[PDB]
């Protein structure tokens, strides 16, 4: 796992996450595929890392859109979706 991939299992979300509707069936599928290779802390913790660079580079970013994918698509991420998470505390 590395931010490449995360990119392009989240990129499906990204109209969702920039205020468009969804979260599409292709996102939630990125999601659910991207929860199953984060298996280990160190995974999660890349997923993190990736994903709080990425946001702060999309334009629009809609953090109740995003905050909303992990139950929308079915995924237990039981850490709020904020810009100031801390991915070290991510297990």
Not at 31 to 36: A, E, G, I, S
Not at 38 to 46: I, L, P, V
Not at 53 to 80: D, E
Request: some cysteine.
């Amino acid at each position: 796992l590395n931010c490449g991939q995360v990119d392009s299992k989240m990129k499906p979300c990204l109209t969702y996450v920039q205020g468009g509707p969804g979260p599409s069936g292709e996102c939630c599928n990125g999601v659910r595929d991207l929860h199953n290779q984060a298996q280990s802390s160190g995974d999660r913790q890349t997923v993190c890392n990736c994903l709080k660079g990425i946001a702060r580079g999309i334009h629009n970013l809609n953090l109740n859109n995003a905050a909303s994918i992990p139950s929308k698509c079915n995924v237990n991420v039981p850490y709020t979706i904020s810009p100031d998470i801390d991915c070290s505390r991510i297990y």
